[PDB]
Design a protein around this nucleic acid. Structure first.
Ligand SMILES: COc1cc(NC(=O)Cc2ccc(Br)cc2)ccc1C[C@H]1COC(=O)N1
Length: 1037
DNA sequence: TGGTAGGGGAAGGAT
DNA sequence: ATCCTTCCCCTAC
């Protein structure tokens, strides 16, 4: 009969816009080859491979790429008698769409589903694979969204006193819509129960009656909540139908192994006829939700496919050396490297190279690849850009990669390709996902996102930005840093030349793209982001896509929604806040005596658990808790100049406390199975426990997001206030109970074998949020760890309710208290520890980092300069503006002056002198507008360079003042109409031979030394700079 | 729709 | 000139 849902992906083409560079035409004179052919053409799109040629949209007998498609434009390319009986299947993503009966009356659906989507119904599509390998999609009918409104509040406000009345009023209100979107919608299209529930906020809140309204269309529900009865609090109206499917059917997950089973009236699932399909899948099914169950024994991934891809483009305008722009039809997409792996076997299966102008890849590349067990690359030759892109999208639709990865493909590759397919060549994308049409293929620019239905996009860029700490995230730098495999860099400045020389010098470009994509693939399967995120999704009841791109809040919200709905609440729709921690004012300096480091194990979550903090256990009014005994039944606490009451556990158990306790016991359970488990299983177990730790640390934050979903800043500020009180109490306890060594020996008969020469003292020296650093003069750092363990156990037992726990983690031999939240120390195990200083701050140049590192390394791993710090301590350090520095410090001078050498002596690496700085916002919204990386940004923009994406790190260097520098400064100032305007791209400032500001980098090295070593001189900065000048020849001051 | 503390460097105004 | 403010980077919990 034909398809029931029109396939919008291109399967036929007779005429297209042909654009291609004239540089590829050899029979043209070398003078008539500069421009770029652009114009309409009326020929069937074709692709060349290995001397043979075939139409792009030709599918069947002979193909150049692999194909996993069945339907292709109403053609059933499946061997007749293809009726694989499906029992179990894995699910990775879930689609939420709408289906109307009038539309589907063509398709031969069972009566049940047509009843489920009578006027309109919401259908939940599970996408995945069978164990055999078949692509599968099961359509779940019956899922209904629903939301609550207070009955006593609606009855009186809408002058109605019955649920059918509410149905009438909602239907009517939807009729007189702006655009008459819902014409003819009547009251019988809604279901309205009356049910008893309790708002989640405040303990005083008692149950009441709420209308529950069921809705079949996300559009209808959205419009209702947005402008129905704006004066009436609406509950759980944001809960989408997928979340209802997961929560209301207990046990289901958003990622894992399901099984079809008999249903309520001995109902079986029904397979769809191919002409009814709505996905690029091999078999599809219709079922109600009771036809589903979970399969338990299954634990391993199925044959999901991962496409890693990178692109490379060339300009075409008057300046072919500038950076391309997808909006200009002259700049074109020249090459696309595309490699497909199997995710269950982590094995590369195919390599493909789309190219404008045929080529042959270099032989060194081919030999390396063929020798590394990899497959034989297959090049695809195209005459136009449209044919190349159309073939790429046809590959995407036919092979149907369930996962897609690359590097910075969110801010460059996909937006370029889709801007080409959209603005220039006018191509619909809604079918080029998993759905045959009406799908999702958008790209967004507090985070950039890429959402493709049935296609999981994981940009390894973000993965590395979160997991690895670097100064710049160029793919080669990341490769050398993580795999220790350096590969060739590339720039657009070199691409046109390599293209013009011919097929071999363009095959070089192909080698570069394929090496990039191989590297990305290696990173991917080292970090396994798919398994990590899939485990998070399974934990939070949220589909993998929203797991990646839609933030954290949604996860905690979904689990809390599950628990509250289970326990009789309903979450109300809402759609520097509170005093944080106090850093213990440290008395600075170098400490050589043993230092002990205590800290709490998950302080904030344990506070929540112990004191039963929750939305439902909080109260702002005394009369609410005036009927129970203070202290024994509730906790009174003053937070932010206001009294708060938290009813204790035995009155009303906290929702947050339950979530935390269950998650924790779950984590402990799965971690107790790591030993007696195969490493294959142990990777999955570790990803699982990682996800659990993530959401557990996500609770408190979720509570503190003012104007977020379900915020309650009272809980957050109570948490912080309790933490501060706990630290203060720990300090005062250690001071008062163990001031006398008599007591130490008393509690622990182990300080006998630990009494040191000097006098005995024990005082808290440092503290931050959940940490205590205690000085132990008069004690030997022998087993200070193993005795501090019994100490912290004693403190926890004697001071804090469970599950609050204090542990002893590290004991320092020497430690440098620099300033607040900044310190360096040497652990008793010989390991160094650096926190807060410019050492760890990846915004400084590698030279000053290495220098300051050597300085501190000397300060800790050289006995003479350590004794010299002790001698600086012997005296008040105030007098030393006229006194001489002890001999031990000599070494410093040496290193310092070596610096000067490396600064001015050429043949040094300029990359060893680059600064970095992240571009936070869109630059138009800025208060100073006079920043280094902003200057570099605007200069890069004027120069038609690579405009940096909206949130990367920009590198830069500092120029010295010249006549050209000041002249161009005045000229740019007049065009717009010394301070650190001397900032330049390392690229431009190396090829133009620009010289660095030698004074600035030495003056900073002196500044970082001043900041790091002000501690040893009573923490005075001016004094430290002055007596630092005593390590530098005065001809440099 | 990820929280509060921090320190220190760059730039600019006020004392 | 000296400070004193404010913004901005990136840390530590
Ligand atoms: C690493 O330290 C901390 C990180 C955080 N992070 C966040 O709150 C970020 C966040 C995540 C998710 C959502 Br939704 C909202 C915000 C909070 C407190 C501490 C302090 C420590 C001390 O004791 C703790 O339990 N955490």
């Amino acid at each position: 009969t034909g398809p029931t849902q029109r396939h919008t992906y291109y399967s036929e083409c007779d005429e297209f816009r042909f654009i291609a560079p004239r540089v590829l035409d050899e029979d043209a004179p070398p003078e008539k080859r500069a421009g770029v052919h652009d114009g309409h053409l009326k020929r069937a799109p074709k692709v060349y491979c290995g001397g043979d040629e075939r139409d792009v949209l030709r599918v069947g007998s002979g193909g150049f790429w692999p194909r996993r498609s069945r339907l292709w434009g109403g053609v059933d390319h499946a061997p007749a008698g293809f009726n694989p009986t499906v029992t179990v299947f894995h699910v990775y993503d879930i689609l939420e769409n709408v289906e109307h009966a009038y539309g589907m009356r063509a398709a031969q659906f069972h009566a049940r589903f047509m009843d489920a989507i009578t006027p309109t119904g919401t259908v939940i599509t599970l996408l995945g694979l069978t164990p055999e390998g078949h692509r599968v999609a099961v359509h779940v009918y019956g899922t209904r969204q629903y939301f609550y409104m207070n009955k006593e509040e609606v009855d009186r406000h809408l002058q109605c006193r019955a649920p059918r009345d509410l149905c009438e009023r909602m239907a009517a209100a939807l009729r007189e819509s702006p655009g008459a979107s819902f014409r003819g919608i009547s009251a019988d299209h809604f279901e309205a129960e009356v049910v008893e529930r309790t708002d989640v906020y405040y303990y005083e809140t008692r149950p009441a009656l709420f209308y529950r309204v069921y809705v079949r269309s996300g559009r209808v529900l959205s419009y209702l909540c947005d402008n129905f009865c704006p004066a009436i609090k609406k509950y759980e109206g944001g809960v989408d139908a997928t979340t209802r499917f997961i929560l209301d059917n207990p046990g289901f997950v958003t990622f894992g192994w399901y099984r079809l089973k008999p249903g309520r009236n001995n109902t079986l699932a029904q397979p769809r006829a191919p002409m009814a399909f709505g996905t690029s899948s091999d078999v599809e099914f219709n079922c109600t939700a009771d036809n589903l169950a979970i399969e338990g024994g299954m634990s391993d991934l199925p044959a999901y496919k991962l496409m890693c891809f990178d692109i490379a483009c060339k300009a075409g305008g008057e300046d072919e050396l500038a950076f391309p722009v997808a909006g200009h039809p002259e700049d074109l997409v020249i090459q696309i490297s595309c490699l497909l792996y199997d995710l269950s076997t982590t094995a590369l299966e195919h390599v493909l190279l789309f190219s404008l102008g045929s080529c042959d890849l270099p032989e060194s590349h081919l030999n390396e690849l063929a020798a590394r067990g990899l497959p034989t690359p297959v090049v695809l030759e195209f005459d136009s850009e449209f044919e190349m892109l159309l073939a790429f999208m046809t590959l995407v639709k036919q092979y149907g990669p369930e996962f897609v990865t690359g590097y910075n493909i969110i801010n460059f590759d996909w937006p370029f390709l889709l801007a080409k397919l959209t603005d220039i060549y006018k191509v619909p994308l809604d079918g080029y996902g998993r759905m045959n049409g009406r799908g999702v293929f958008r790209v967004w620019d507090k985070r950039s996102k890429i959402k493709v239905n049935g296609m999981v996009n994981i940009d390894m860029y973000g993965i590395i930005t979160d997991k690895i700490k670097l100064s710049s995230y160029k793919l080669n730098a990341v490769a050398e840093a993580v795999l220790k495999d350096k590969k060739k860099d590339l720039s657009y400045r070199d691409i046109p030349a390599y293209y013009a020389a011919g097929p071999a010098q363009r095959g070089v470009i192909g080698e570069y793209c394929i090496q990039d994509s191989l590297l990305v693939g290696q990173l991917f399967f080292k970090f396994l982001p798919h398994l990590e995120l899939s485990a998070v999704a399974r934990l939070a009841g949220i589909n993998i896509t929203r797991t990646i791109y839609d933030g954290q809040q949604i996860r905690v919200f979904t689990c809390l929604l599950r628990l509250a709905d289970q326990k009789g609440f309903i979450l109300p729709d809402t759609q520097v806040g509170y005093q944080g921690a106090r850093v213990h004012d440290p008395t600075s300096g170098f400490h050589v005596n043993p230092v002990v480091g205590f800290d709490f194990a998950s302080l904030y979550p344990s506070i929540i658990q112990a004191h039963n903090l929750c939305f439902s256990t909080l109260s702002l009014r005394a009369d609410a808790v005036a009927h129970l005994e203070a202290g024994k039944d509730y906790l009174e606490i003053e937070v932010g100049g206001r009294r708060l009451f938290f009813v204790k556990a035995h009155v009303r158990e906290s929702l947050l406390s339950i979530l935390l306790r269950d998650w924790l016991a779950m984590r402990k359970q799965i971690r107790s199975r790591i030993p007696q488990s195969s490493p294959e299983e142990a990777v999955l177990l570790d990803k699982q426990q990682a996800a659990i730790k993530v959401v557990c640390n996500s609770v408190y934050g979720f509570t503190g997001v003012q104007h977020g979903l379900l915020p309650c800043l009272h809980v957050a500020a109570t948490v912080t206030t309790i933490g501060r009180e706990m630290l203060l109490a720990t300090r005062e306890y250690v001071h008062a109970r163990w001031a006398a060594f008599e007591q130490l020996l008393a509690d622990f008969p182990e300080a006998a074998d630990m009494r040191a020469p000097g006098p005995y003292s024990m005082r808290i020296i440092y503290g931050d949020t959940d940490s205590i650093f205690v000085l132990c003069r008069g004690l030997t750092a022998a087993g200070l760890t193993a005795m501090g363990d019994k100490m912290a156990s004693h403190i926890s037992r004697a001071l804090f309710l469970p599950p609050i726990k204090l542990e002893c983690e590290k004991t320092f031999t020497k430690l440098l208290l620099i300033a607040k939240k900044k310190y360096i120390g040497v652990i008793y195990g010989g390991k160094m520890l650096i926190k807060g200083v410019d050492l760890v701050r990846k915004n400084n140049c590698a030279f000053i980092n290495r220098t300051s590192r050597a300085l501190v390394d000397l300060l800790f791993y050289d006995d003479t300069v350590s004794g010299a710090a002790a001698a600086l301590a012997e005296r008040p350090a105030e007098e030393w503006l006229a006194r001489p520095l002890p001999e031990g410090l000599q070494a410093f001078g040496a290193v310092l002056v070596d610096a000067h050498r490396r600064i001015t002596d050429p043949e040094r690496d300029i990359q060893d002198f680059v600064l970095t700085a992240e571009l936070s916002r869109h630059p138009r919204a800025y208060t100073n507008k006079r920043l280094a990386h902003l200057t570099v940004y605007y200069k890069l923009m004027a120069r038609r360079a690579q405009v940096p994406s909206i949130k990367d790190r920009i590198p830069y260097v500092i120029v010295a003042q010249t006549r050209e520098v000041e002249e161009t400064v005045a000229r740019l100032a007049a065009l717009r109409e010394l301070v650190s305007e001397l900032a330049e791209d390392p690229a431009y400032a190396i090829a133009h031979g620009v010289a660095l500001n030698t004074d600035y980098y030495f003056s900073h090295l002196l500044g970082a030394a001043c900041v790091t070593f002000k501690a040893l001189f009573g923490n005075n900065a001016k004094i430290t700079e002055s007596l630092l000048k005593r390590f530098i020849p005065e001809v440099w001051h």
